Amino acid sequence: SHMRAFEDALQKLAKAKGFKPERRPLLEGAFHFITSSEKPPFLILQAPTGYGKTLLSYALAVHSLYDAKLFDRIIHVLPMRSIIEDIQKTAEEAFGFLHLFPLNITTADTFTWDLLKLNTKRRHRGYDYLTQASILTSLVIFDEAHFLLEDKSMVTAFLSVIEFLTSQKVPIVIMTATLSEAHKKIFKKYANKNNYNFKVLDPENDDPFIKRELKKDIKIEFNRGDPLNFIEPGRRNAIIVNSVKRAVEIFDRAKNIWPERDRVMLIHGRMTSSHKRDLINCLRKWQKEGDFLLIGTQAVEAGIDFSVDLMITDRAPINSLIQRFGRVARYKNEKEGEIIILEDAPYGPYPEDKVEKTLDLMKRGQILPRIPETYQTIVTEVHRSITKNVNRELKGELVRLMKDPSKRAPDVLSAVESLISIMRDFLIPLLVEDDMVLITPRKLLELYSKELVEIKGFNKEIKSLEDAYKVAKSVALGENIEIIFIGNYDWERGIP
């Protein structure tokens, strides 16, 4: 065999999470492929939601302190909106992890700023890594995070970071339940262009996991109106919506509606890390004890491990919905669940094209979850096209800039300004008192007009979105400014 790192992680994790193992072949196959493998490996692990794919990351990480010929640490990338506190809290509790950590958990926009040599410091708080060069000595695992290609505002950048990563022959794993083949092709391209050892592992017809979940029946229904029309006390409930503001106002009423106020909970991303971890701890207590209602946004979807009897979610494109569906009957002796998609809900950040097409195709071909046969074709038809909006001459300059030591943040910033910028999505540190909260340039403006922000060390005192985009400019440059919250942070609602 020759993998006792893998089983070391499987035991230490299965202790902490209190489950008894099952062998999950694709995980083993993926671990071996990585540790074996002549060349730089480029794995696409295409496994259903709930398989246990985060194990591979844990395993590989407890394989970095023994063998370091291929990589010296693991960088685990979650999606942009995502909450990373849950994986951090089992890396810390289950395995005991500027310093060198075996397992670093980041978010996909942070990741690309880092590779663009931009200042991401207070995001990494000591600090786990702070340099492009540490990333180049890593194995980089995207955990459902490649879906930055479906964001118009980033695709050109995240593609340059895929191009550049592959150019430096960094080993790469791509974890996803929902792999389009438009996606598969641009990955395979860059993995072939740089002579990786490319490989796709999807489950095959005998998989002990798919059959565990074929036995389950989890009904999915469509509906309209207020999400609290559909709650069911006495079961584990979860309402997942597409914006934090939507989530907050549902929670403002759910606190009074739900029988036990103790068991109503709001999670989104506009909260402090301290707060997030507090909630993660309450949430793991809540799963073994009885019933509760959880209000959340997409932030809960790639990286948080919970399981809920009834789920009510907004309509969203198929990758997001599969993600969300995965959290309903997730563990093994849970065989019945219900899902309610709200076809009238607002799109939020999502493109309307893809959301509607998603809902048209599901309604034709009723899909059973965690069982790719049912959703694979929806995925490939929805999640296509990316090449349309790639500013491919900038994508070229970005890959030359990262490759060049002589070029730093100032040069990459004024490069993109020619071709205010992509800076729409450069989240900046709002400091609430000792903790912080990432917020978009635009909610920085909003919070400024309401006179809840004070900026030490910058003096144009924000109006005009372009003023905000300049705060983001200087934060990315490492300017000595502080963006401070003056209001009193709401310890259940997060930030406005």
What does the binding site for ligand ATP look like in residue numbers (CB under 6 A)?
10, 17, 19, 21-22, 24, 47, 49-55, 177, 302, 305, 326, 331
Interaction between residue 106 and Mg ion (CB under 5 A)? no
- 494, interface contact from ligand ATP, Mg ion, none, CB < 5-8 Å by kind: none
Of 104 and 421, nearer to ligand ATP (C-beta) is 104
- 10, interface contact from Mg ion, ligand ATP, none, CB < 5-8 Å by kind: ligand ATP
Q: What are 296's two structure tokens? A: 């959340």
**Smallest gap, in angstroms, from Cβ of residue 114 to ligand ATP?**
23
Of 165 and 177, nearer to ligand ATP (C-beta) is 177
Of 309 and 397, nearer to ligand ATP (C-beta) is 309
Interaction between residue 90 and Mg ion (CB under 5 A)? no
By beta carbon distance, the residue nearest ligand ATP is 52
**Strand pairing report for 292-296 and 264-267:** parallel
Of 284 and 357, nearer to ligand ATP (C-beta) is 284
**Smallest gap, in angstroms, from Cβ of residue 219 to ligand ATP?**
19
Q: In 4-70, where do the E strands start and end? A: 41-46
Contact status, residue 398 vs residue 415, Cβ threshold 8 Å: yes
Q: How far apart are CA 458 and CA 78, in angstroms?
A: 32
Interaction between residue 323 and Mg ion (CB under 5 A)? no
* DSSP string computed for 385-396: -GGGG--HHHHH
Of 16 and 68, nearer to ligand ATP (C-beta) is 16
Interaction between residue 138 and Mg ion (CB under 5 A)? no
**Smallest gap, in angstroms, from Cβ of residue 76 to Mg ion?**
9
CA distances from 127 to 175, 219, 232, 426 (A): 26, 45, 43, 20
Contact status, residue 317 vs residue 382, Cβ threshold 8 Å: yes
CA distances from 349 to 31, 143, 156, 269, 302 (A): 35, 20, 18, 14, 17
Interaction between residue 82 and Mg ion (CB under 5 A)? no
- 165, interface contact from ligand ATP, Mg ion, none, CB < 5-8 Å by kind: none
**Smallest gap, in angstroms, from Cβ of residue 173 to Mg ion?**
13
Backbone angles phi, psi at 403, to 5 degrees: -70, -20
Of 314 and 425, nearer to ligand ATP (C-beta) is 314
* DSSP string computed for 219-280: EEEEE-S-GGGG--TTSEEEEE-SSHHHHHHHHHHHHHHSS-GGGEEEE-SSS-HHHHHHHH
Of 63 and 395, nearer to ligand ATP (C-beta) is 63
**Smallest gap, in angstroms, from Cβ of residue 319 to ligand ATP?**
10
How far from chain centre, in Å, is Cα 160?
19
Contact status, residue 66 vs residue 5, Cβ threshold 8 Å: yes
Interaction between residue 180 and Mg ion (CB under 5 A)? no
Contact status, residue 357 vs residue 244, Cβ threshold 8 Å: no
**Smallest gap, in angstroms, from Cβ of residue 281 to ligand ATP?**
16
Q: How many residues bind Mg ion (CB under 5 A)?
A: 2
- 52, interface contact from ligand ATP, Mg ion, none, CB < 5-8 Å by kind: ligand ATP
Of 78 and 386, nearer to Mg ion (C-beta) is 78
Q: How far apart are CA 151 and CA 111, in angstroms?
A: 15
Interaction between residue 319 and Mg ion (CB under 5 A)? no
Of 166 and 297, nearer to Mg ion (C-beta) is 297
Backbone angles phi, psi at 52, to 5 degrees: 125, 25
Q: In 40-196, where do the E strands start and end? A: 41-46, 74-78, 103-107, 139-143, 172-176
Residues 6+ apart with CB under 8 A from 8: 59, 62
Of 311 and 416, nearer to ligand ATP (C-beta) is 311
**Smallest gap, in angstroms, from Cβ of residue 71 to ligand ATP?**
20
With tokens 């490492």, the residue in question is 478
- 106, interface contact from ligand ATP, Mg ion, none, CB < 5-8 Å by kind: none
- 227, interface contact from Mg ion, ligand ATP, none, CB < 5-8 Å by kind: none
Which DSSP category does 182 fall into? H
- 22, interface contact from ligand ATP, Mg ion, none, CB < 5-8 Å by kind: ligand ATP
By beta carbon distance, the residue nearest Mg ion is 54
- 365, interface contact from ligand ATP, Mg ion, none, CB < 5-8 Å by kind: none
* 42-79 burial: b if 16+ Cβ within 10 Å, else e: bbbbbbbbbbbbbbbbbbbbbbbeeeeeebebbbbbbb
Interaction between residue 54 and Mg ion (CB under 5 A)? yes
**Strand pairing report for 428-432 and 435-439:** antiparallel
Of 86 and 163, nearer to ligand ATP (C-beta) is 86
**Smallest gap, in angstroms, from Cβ of residue 387 to ligand ATP?**
26
Residues 285-304 interacting with Mg ion (rule: CB under 5 A)? 303
User: Which residue stretches of 315-391 are H helix?
Assistant: 318-326, 352-364, 376-382
Q: Pick the stretch among 47-55, 120-128, 238-246, 318-326 that binds Mg ion (CB under 5 A).
A: 47-55
Contact positions vs Mg ion (CB under 5 A): 54, 303
